[PDB]
Amino acid sequence: MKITAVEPFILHLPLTHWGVVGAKITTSDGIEGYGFTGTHAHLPSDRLITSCISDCYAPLLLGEDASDHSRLWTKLARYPSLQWVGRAGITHLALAAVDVALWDIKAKKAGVPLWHYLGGARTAGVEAYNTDIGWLSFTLEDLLAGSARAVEEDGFTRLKIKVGHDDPNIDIARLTAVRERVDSAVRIAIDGNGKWDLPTCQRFCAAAKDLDIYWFEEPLWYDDVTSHARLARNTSIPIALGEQLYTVDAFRSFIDAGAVAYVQPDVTRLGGITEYIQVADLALAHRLPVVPHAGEMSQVHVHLSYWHPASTILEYIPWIKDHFEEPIHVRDGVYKRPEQPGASTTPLAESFTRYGKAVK
Amino acid sequence: MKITAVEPFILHLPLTHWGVVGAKITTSDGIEGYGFTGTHAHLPSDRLITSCISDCYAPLLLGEDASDHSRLWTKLARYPSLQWVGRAGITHLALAAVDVALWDIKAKKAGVPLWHYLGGARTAGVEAYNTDIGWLSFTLEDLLAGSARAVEEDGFTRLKIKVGHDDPNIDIARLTAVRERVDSAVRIAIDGNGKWDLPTCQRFCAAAKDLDIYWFEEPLWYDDVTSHARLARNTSIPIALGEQLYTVDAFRSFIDAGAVAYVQPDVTRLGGITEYIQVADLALAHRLPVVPHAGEMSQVHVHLSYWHPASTILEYIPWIKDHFEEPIHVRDGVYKRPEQPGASTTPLAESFTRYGKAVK
Amino acid sequence: MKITAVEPFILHLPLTHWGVVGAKITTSDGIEGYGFTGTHAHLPSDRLITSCISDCYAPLLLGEDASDHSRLWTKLARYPSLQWVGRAGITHLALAAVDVALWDIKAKKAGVPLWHYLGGARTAGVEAYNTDIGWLSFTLEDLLAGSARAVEEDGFTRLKIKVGHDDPNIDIARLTAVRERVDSAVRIAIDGNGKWDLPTCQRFCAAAKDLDIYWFEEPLWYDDVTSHARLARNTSIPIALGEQLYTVDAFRSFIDAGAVAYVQPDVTRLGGITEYIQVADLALAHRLPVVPHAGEMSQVHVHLSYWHPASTILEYIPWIKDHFEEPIHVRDGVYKRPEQPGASTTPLAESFTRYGKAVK
Amino acid sequence: MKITAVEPFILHLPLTHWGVVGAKITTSDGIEGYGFTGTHAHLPSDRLITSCISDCYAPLLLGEDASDHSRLWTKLARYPSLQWVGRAGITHLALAAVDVALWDIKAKKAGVPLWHYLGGARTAGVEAYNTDIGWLSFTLEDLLAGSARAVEEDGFTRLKIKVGHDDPNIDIARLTAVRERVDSAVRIAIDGNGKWDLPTCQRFCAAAKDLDIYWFEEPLWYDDVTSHARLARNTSIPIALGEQLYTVDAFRSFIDAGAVAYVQPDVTRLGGITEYIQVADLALAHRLPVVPHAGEMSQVHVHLSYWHPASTILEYIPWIKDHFEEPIHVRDGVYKRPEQPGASTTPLAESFTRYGKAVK
Amino acid sequence: MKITAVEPFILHLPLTHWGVVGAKITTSDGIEGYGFTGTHAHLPSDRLITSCISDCYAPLLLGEDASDHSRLWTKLARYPSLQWVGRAGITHLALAAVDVALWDIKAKKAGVPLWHYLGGARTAGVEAYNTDIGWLSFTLEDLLAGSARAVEEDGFTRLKIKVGHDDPNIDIARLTAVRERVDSAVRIAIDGNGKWDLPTCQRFCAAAKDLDIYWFEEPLWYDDVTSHARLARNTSIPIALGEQLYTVDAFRSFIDAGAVAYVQPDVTRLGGITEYIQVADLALAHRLPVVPHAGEMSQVHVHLSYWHPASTILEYIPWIKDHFEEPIHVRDGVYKRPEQPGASTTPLAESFTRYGKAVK
Ligand SMILES: [Cl-]
Ligand SMILES: [Cl-]
Ligand SMILES: [Cl-]
Ligand SMILES: [Cl-]
Ligand SMILES: [Cl-]
Asked: Do residue D199 and residue B289 have CB atoms under 8 angstroms apart?
């Protein structure tokens, strides 16, 4: 159906805030689709994304058939003046938001949740891992208490804990303490957020040999394929990355080099669901697991991980879920399978009233 | 909707015959989907495929929601007793037929042609190349006359000519004659159908250095990645292959080795549209062109090439088109964009009446 | 001598059953040869193999000199309509059965067991490893009791234990318990049946560093060479595979990549003895050991491992041996050397009466 | 000296227009530095860059010592909320403008042209190549006349001609005609602007074997390293690229892979002069020539090429030079060495009056 | 049957002479097997081989079952004191003679020619190439006359011509003259007998670019794998080698490095038929053609090429054929298929009488 309106929006949601920055696209039948990227919720930079949506993309969308999501992806991504200042960064993040909104429309029009629209479920239950208990800012005391709570009270058996102290031996100590505190059958991944260099990572990985580390996410600088490839060969600890990669080309470079074992596409960083599927298919071809980064707090990725056969487990951070018409939900470490039509990107009406910010 | 019947069929269509061997799948709403593989039309081997469909796959399909095409692909592909004698060959070809039928249903239920269902057109016109004028059995005078007719009367600007004489210099002579006869603006690809070894191909490619060969399809043994990689490095002539590869895994091996430049998935050889899309996405990640082999005489591939953004040109062989509810059609070297709901796999009643063969 | 009859057969033998699916080939002198592949004993899929034998291969065999086993291998394997839907899967499994039957005839006509026909014994005793005590379905209690019995009562000093729980630490625990229970001089190989991905295998292999694992069979997806190559470089635990590979080309890809150390051809998966010997010679060239997978429960492989100089040890599963005219036999962990003319593929006459199933 | 103001500006200069989009930075002593990126001059996208400068970077610059250009590069590039939506694209282009402005200030305060500030001249004369005669839009007669005029009347001995027709043989025809028209001592580089795929490029390069092509710029997709590496090995024609690469990391990937011989950093695409120097030093380490792309129409690059010892020749496009206080000037194919203090980025008042656009 | 005698022999046959140096092995049933290596017919070095046979191998053979050819190969090859001074050279050449004799016995006892014993014919006719017209010692006029006679009078369509002048341009001149004289449909391979170094070969191959050279045999030093690999990548001319390689290990090194395309095992250099088959199987795995070198003047290789499916064409040199009970025979460029029981290694009585030399 024809697109009749494209309206950007900015929500600043409490955890200082997570930025949900995106597009509401309306079609002639009254269906409204939502898509968004994720930000640090600084208004002036959020507005660069919304300005791209309203000022650059909206004119390319109005009057077009929203059903043509593949064709429209290319129309926007390859628009010469925009790709000139793009292929990555703010134009690509704005593209992601539009793309997700178009898929939300497709599934809504079909009257089904996105995982069903795409071809059905590949599992009866997508297992979750809890990231929210693992932030680097936590004292050891608080890291331990939250980890224990997640496992002993909330039924998680998979956690992700941040590392990245200047001296990685501090992280060895923290992880050692967590390993002593929780049951051995708890899986523990770690995440360095690109903080360390190759030699630092080599030493840390050797020192972590007995800690049963599930994966090491973003150990090295985001755009440095070779360091990751060298690290992967130097340790048995699996390397995970993808959060920060904007394109299928970047994923191909990392995957083909053996620089990543756990592939982490993100519809808010790549060009939406469209480019996500391309990367997930690339991972499938290599028989590598797809574990997407929660740039949208898993609101979209729950669908993709219920559907795409290379998927395994799914990141859980509960910050924003209750602000959506269909919150993600985890019970005893398993994601509920979505039921509502669309991609569960639709915020509650009150979310705009309470947390919305002016785009201009 | 629930699957209520699965009926295999065999057509032996004249050009000595082309085998259209597949499945008609009916759902509770009365919609009928068709999918098929392509064979040499020998009844006893055709019946191995249909028996797999009726005796092995039908029990796994009846009562299932046809909408769940992704889940059902896995259910059939990974059924233990079947994959034990599978992963390639008969079982995988039967899987392809089923998968295509499920996608035909999906697009029929949506009321749109498959290319539109998938997200819209990536081009206003898919250019064709004529393979039917180039068979190795043609005398030089007939090769010349047909090549010239296709170009000068029928408006093709792209041809594919078979090679594969025991002495490749005979093929050099034939191609030299065609090049002299037709305008220089005619693109001419060639196809060896896996007939030669590496050294033979090295010599031939060097001898063809001035013939402006667009690509060399299946120069070497189908399962030999390394020979293709070595050939690709030894010549500037691009290598095309894929029509004999059964799995995404095989395509990954060839693509990552630099053993193929023109990637040729085939929904009749891979596991249908489902696996085709995975391979096309893999090619996209490498920025390689997707030019599918006409194992279904382009009835399905016309949709996929109109849609998938890595697609370029499309093989044309006119043998069976007139036996379909929506025949492919090429005018002035360009494929007509399909209009009818479905994947244009539905044959006419006359085809079954005149050319249908008993499956048991 | 001329082939006068080709008759497929299906036996379902108790361990729910193992399928012995093959061909009985009769020559003009009254000699009858037997060859077979192995299946899960599901009648409808077994019949695809027998239908290939009767409907496609028999016409190509009747009247031919059975002595010409090499020429006939090519005649069947490369028959255009069949290789079109082959190179792997059901056509290739049917080929294996025919090939083995032809070799059984050759040795029977010569009046000697196959290992002697081929050129004599390379060892005085082929050592066995017991797989039958190691199934993944066994409780730890039963795994321990059977392992202990095999070693302490039955004289095995080599075992193979299955792994592949979703959490490999469960397999670490099981193997740790077995290692504690049996003497240190017991060799223990493991087998994952392609269940895990690369990062999972890396972690498991590191965690198994002190368990003295003899080899790790099929750790990764069967058609994924690169993951196996990366794993092999990441651990000192040797990688074994081949059970699932249909062709010499696939073996070459794995072997040349350093993706396999223990080479496991199988006459029931490859194209019979003919293709087995090619793969064993390929392994010999690389000075790698040949340890064939018991797809025929070692009835044929006992001959090949007594003869081929790259051979080392031999898998033992006792399910079907007593149904043959010359059962394999293991005493104190050593295979008896076969005595009877042929390839010990001939079932007892009563086996057909008791366990035979109609092919049509 | 302390930064007291940061003012973005947008110029749309006629050649349909070239966008000069940047920042004027004022220090407490009244010195004004100018820096800019280059765009297609579409106001709504230009404003994304200026908004980043005013809304995001200005608060990080005001009150800082402009002398600290290295520290300030890092402060802006790594500001967490900005790098989160950056590392490339809009934020990085805005960073480039700021960085160039700070270097302009540095050289102005020193009272010398930038090439002198940096350490003096590596050559008595930087030779130019004329790009402006070679646009793909030119008819053959106009391509010929302009190429000949540049050489025979204006004293150029180096040209760059666009390629990129759908059929590269049209480009072969055009280049053949130019080669026949002009003296053999004229160097002719070509530029495909990322239009073709690997196989197309292989065929074209082989067809251009006798045309004495100096380099082939951007033959392939900008983010595809492997295709460039494979092409570079397949032809003797040198590959040039860099004008679309945003980071030193991307340049390292291409250079180390042997995917580029002529390295083309651009201060308007990389993070200014600061990052340009890093890339030029990387090229120097590989003994590869540095030939920067004219994203700033060589106003800045004339300094960098006069100075950096890996520099060779310099692109010339005359579109905007007359709008600057110190226009580039080429006589007899040689660039004039800049004389005025600064980086020759200061535009004339008339340019703002006639071609300036409102940023908000 | 038990071996009752082992008698070495030396024949110096005229073409200055070719040395046929080997073993006659008698079994208890009176069957006599013959096998031999090929030498330059210098008596004192020939006697080293015969002394190894009589003094070292005979004691290991007497009383053994000749049927056990595989076991006996190992017994002799690995005898510690012998392998200590072996693995190549004299001991291995003597081993070859013994091995061939045992296979001759095997086929004689079976009452069939060796190609039939091994499993039947892979072709209706093995094509020959004439080497005897191409010796480096021939003047150009004699090279021309003989090449033309072979083609125009004797019906050869395949020739091999020696190269190896100090200045390879003399060889270019000779080959150019032959190419001008004979029809273009004549295939012409060349052979340098290890005379040149890598750079010399690179220049020669480039100079031969238009001479349609079928293969370049032994271009480089026999034990230098890397030079061959580098040459093979530098030219389209195929590299052939193997006639100087003693072991399967050496062949594996060359084949896996891409240093050979035409694989040339020789039963007189490798350890007989036994090792030849291993190498032929290795070549088959790589889909490379097997074209054995005539160290036994094709008396044995005619069988192996009629049988082994990787075989293609066969070298022809007529020097010694008339001295055998079953001479090779070539008519119209095709080898006669052997008919007599055995491996056609049995010499005529006259050969011993006229050309036999005392071994002690
Ligand atoms: Cl996982
Ligand atoms: Cl194309
Ligand atoms: Cl072993
Ligand atoms: Cl230069
Ligand atoms: Cl050949």
From this structure: yes
Task: Confirm whether residue E217 is marked as ligand binding.
Answer: yes
- How far is residue E17 from each of residues B209, E42, E325, E359, measured CA to CA in Å? 45, 9, 20, 17
Cα three-residue angle A233-A236-A241, rounded to 5 degrees: 75
What distance in angstroms lies between residue C259's CA and the mean position of ligand 3's atoms? 17
- Residue D10 pairs in a beta bridge with D21, D357
Amino acid at the residue C356: G
Beta carbons of E282 and C287 less than 8 Å apart = no
Partners of E314 in beta bridges: E128
Q: Which of E1, E56, E66 is nearest to E34 (CA)?
A: E66
Ligand 2: distance of its center to the CA of D134 in Å? Answer: 26
Q: Are strands D213-217 and E17-27 parallel, antiparallel or unpaired?
A: unpaired
Give burial (CB, 10 Å; 0-12/13-18/19+) of B66: buried
Told to judge if D75 belongs to the known catalytic residues of this protein, a careful annotator would answer no
**DSSP H or E stretch at residue E187:** strand E187-191
D90 vs A89, A225, A250: nearest CB: A89
Alpha-carbon D173 to chain mean position: 29
Closest CA to A162 of A197, A209, A194, A127: A194
Strand, coil or helix: C154: coil
Kind plus residue range of the DSSP H or E element containing E13: strand E3-14
Smallest Cα–Cα separation from D93: which of C35, A82, C146?
A: A82
Tokens read off for E245: 């390689």
H-type helices in chain E, by residue range?
Answer: 43-51, 58-61, 69-77, 80-83, 90-110, 114-117, 140-152, 168-181, 198-207, 225-234, 248-256, 272-285, 301-307, 349-355
Instruction: Give CATH 3.20.20.120 domain extents, chain C.
Output: 112-348
| Residue E42 CB coordination number (10 Å) | 11
Contacts of C170 (CB under 8 A, 6+ apart): none
CA atoms within 13 A on the CB side of B38: 22
Q: Length of chain C, please?
A: 360
Are the beta carbons of D203 and B237 separated by less than 8 Å?
A: yes
DSSP structure class, residue A79: -
**Closest chain A residue by Cα to residue B111:** A110
Residue D296: partners with Cβ closer than 8 Å, 6 or more residues away: D20, D36, D37, D38, D100, D266, D267, D268, D345
CA–CA dist C311, A7 (Å, integer): 71
Nearest to B321 by CA among B8, B9, B18: B18
Distance CA B93, CA B87 (A): 10
- What letter would DSSP give residue D8? E
Way the structure was solved: X-ray
CATH number belonging to the domain at E112-348, selected among 3.40.50.150, 3.40.50.720, 2.60.120.460, 3.20.20.120: 3.20.20.120
Task: Choose among A178, A173, A190: nearest CA to A149.
Answer: A178
> Residue C259 and residue B253: Cα distance in Å, rounded?
14
Tell me, in angstroms, the distance from the centre of ligand 4 to residue D312's CA: 5
* DSSP count for chain E of H helices, then E strands: 14, 13
Any idea what DSSP says for residue A56? I
Q: How far apart are CA A33 and CA A12, in angstroms?
A: 19
CB B190 within 8 A of CB E223: no
| Domain covering D1-111+349-360 in this structure, CATH number | 3.30.390.10
Alpha-carbon B89 to chain mean position:
16
**What phi and psi values does residue B215 have, to the nearest 5 degrees?**
-160, 160
Helix B168-181 to helix B198-207 angle (10° resolution) is 30
SS (H, E, C) E127-182: EEEECCCCCCCCCHHHHHHHHHHHHHCCCCCEEEEECCCCCHHHHHHHHHHHHHHC
User: According to CATH, where is 3.30.390.10 located in chain E?
Assistant: 1-111+349-360
